[PDB]
Amino acid sequence: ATLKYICAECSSKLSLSRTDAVRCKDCGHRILLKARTKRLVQFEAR
């Protein structure tokens, strides 16, 4: 539910510490993406 990152190759929910380097645990591939804020954005449908 409460993550930090997501692998771009295998669309997989992840989360790791900068003390534990980079890359996907159960995929390999070194990519990674930040994942949407739960902050919630409101748009004028204009």
Binding residues for Zn(2+): 7, 10, 24, 27
Three-state DSSP at 11 gives coil
Q: Return d(Cα 22, Cα 39) in angstroms, integer.
A: 25
Total residue length of the chain: 46
- CB of 20 or CB of 39, closer to Zn ion: 20
Q: Return d(Cα 13, Cα 25) in angstroms, integer.
A: 10
Task: Report the nearest approach of other proteins to the CB of residue 37 (Å).
Answer: 4
22 near other proteins, rule: CB under 8 A: yes
Binding-site ranges for other proteins (CB under 8 A):
4-5, 8, 11, 18, 21-23, 30-37, 39-46
